[PDB]
Symmetry: none
Subunit: 43 residues, 2 copies
């Protein structure tokens, strides 16, 4: 009633860290290939 505060139900139970790691991996893979193609470098 006085202050407003919320809380997560999952409480960091499920493997969220695993998802994060994988997420960056995919984004990095594509992001790398994209920038690499623009650089026009074989090495």
């Amino acid at each position: 009633g006085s202050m407003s505060q919320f809380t997560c139900e999952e409480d960091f139970y499920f493997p969220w860290l695993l998802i994060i790691i994988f997420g960056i991996f995919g984004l990095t893979v594509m992001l790398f290939v994209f920038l690499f193609s623009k650089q026009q470098r074989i090495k």
Copy 2:
């Protein structure tokens, strides 16, 4: 309906589906680079 099922007719993007797609992406990216290197390594 106690249990639940997912079908194409439903026409709805589930959360688990997103994980699956990404999963194969990462595995394919590495699996591809690995096989690619082996294809060049040997004449």
